[PDB]
Amino acid sequence: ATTYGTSTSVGVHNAYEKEKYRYFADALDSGAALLELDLWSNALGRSWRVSHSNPLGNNSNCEGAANASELRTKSRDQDFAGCLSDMRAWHDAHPGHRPILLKIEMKDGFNAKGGRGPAEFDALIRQKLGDAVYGPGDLTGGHATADEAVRAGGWPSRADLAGKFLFELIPGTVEEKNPFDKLWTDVEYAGHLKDLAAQGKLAQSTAFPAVHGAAPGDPRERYADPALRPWFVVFDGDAATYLNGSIDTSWYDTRHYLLIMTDAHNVPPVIDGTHPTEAEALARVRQLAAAHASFATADWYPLPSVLKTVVPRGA
Ligand SMILES: [Cl-]
């Protein structure tokens, strides 16, 4: 049987977009293993916005359903709390559902000073999803760090993660463009986990920060503070880059780290990001699995059968 660390599965980028999925419920029902959401924390006023582009209100397929009977009924363009409500409603209506990873790009990083930092992020997810989350506290157990835990014992079996949501955080594109040196999402959230762990409060955490940007060796060497490094057990980078010869991807599989490969369609020879043939997409997923991906992501909403695919990771 596979574990969350020994399988390869498929994700949909920007799954909150109405053009892909009329309602977020449709994204949840797609069978995809990974659904990506773009969040903004530094817009004015309350709420985490959900939007591809600079937000004006929100632009999303989330409806803030109160229960499953309300799915596919309400006005959309709801915020992050709205998406989380859809998830809870859908969750309750699908006992034992496949585990789903919500990949969160914090477009503009966190906004601690405005009440939208790591702690508030966790608190909101706890409020909306409660026991349905498998977070760093769950993986880490009695171990000193997430890294120690995952290397020694790996992830639970996929069967055991039935009915669970997981969260991945990456830094955002706007964040990468800041002329100043405000801490990025990755270091900020990893530091939050480190501080929680030191305080004996890792249980209240809700998300795994990822190292974003494919790189050779141990990508966590990019962080000057070695104390932050063992809180990163997820890595997220360009598929073609991972396959270009410069990176030993077996390293991730050996250590049971999750490896998300983005723009899976751009691996040569390129295939369509949205409407490839089923055969093309499946071959691509198998290729990336052999290359030790945990997830292959693209825009393949027209191919739910492919989105549902789960195969052995590596060999
Ligand atoms: Cl594992």
Query: In the chain, what are the domains?
Result: 1-315 (3.20.20.190)
Distance CA 97, CA 100 (A): 8
User: Which residues precede gaps in the chain, with C-N > 2.5 A?
Assistant: none
By DSSP bridging, strand 295-298 and strand 7-12 are parallel
Query: What ranges in the chain are assigned the alpha helix state H?
Result: 24-28, 80-93, 118-129, 136-140, 146-153, 185-198, 239-242, 250-254, 278-290, 304-307
The owner of tokens 């574990």 is 3
Say which amino acid occupies 191: G
H helices of 182-290, where? 185-198, 239-242, 250-254, 278-290
> DSSP string covering 34-84, please?
EEEEEEESSSSSSS-EE-SSS-SS---S----SSGGGTT-S-----HHHHH
Task: Report the separation in Å between the CA atom of 311 and the middle of ligand 1, taken as the mean of its atom positions.
Answer: 14
* Residue 254 CA to ligand 1 centre (angstroms): 9
How far does the centroid of ligand 1 lie from the alpha carbon of residue 3, in Å? Answer: 5
What is the rounded distance in angstroms from the CA atom of residue 39 to the CA atom of residue 110? 10
Q: In degrees rounded to 5, what are phi and psi of residue 302?
A: -70, -5
Q: What angle do CA 284, 289, 293 make, to 5 degrees?
A: 105
The Å distance, Cα 289 to ligand 1 centre, comes to 14
Q: Which run of H or of E encompasses 209?
A: strand 208-212
Measured in Å, residue 260 CA sits from the centre of ligand 1 at 15
Q: What's the 158 CA to ligand 1 centre distance in angstroms? A: 10
Asked how this structure was determined, the answer is: X-ray
* CA dist., res. 137 & res. 201, Å (int): 8
Q: Name the token pair of 291.
A: 């290359």
Centre of ligand 1 from the C-alpha of residue 237, in Å: 20
β-pairing verdict for 165-171 and 208-212: parallel
Is 271:265 a contact under the CB 8 Å cutoff?
Answer: yes
Residues 6+ apart with CB under 8 A from 40: 48, 49, 50, 51, 54, 55, 106, 107, 108
The alpha carbon of 136 and the centre of ligand 1 are apart by a number of angstroms equal to 14
C-alpha closest to that of 308 among 99, 5, 105, 15: 99
Separation between Cα atoms, residue 220 and residue 34, nearest integer Å: 23
* Nearby residues for ligand 1 (ion, Cβ within 5 Å): 3, 5, 154-155, 256
- Distance CA(176)–CA(233), nearest Å, equals 21
Query: Exposed/middle/buried for 98, CB within 10 Å: 0-12, 13-18, 19+?
Result: middle
Task: Report which secondary-structure segment, H or E, holds 104.
Answer: strand 100-106
| CA 284 to centroid of ligand 1, rounded, Å | 22
Q: How far is the CA of 293 from the centre of ligand 1 (A)?
A: 13
Strands 49-50 and 34-40: antiparallel
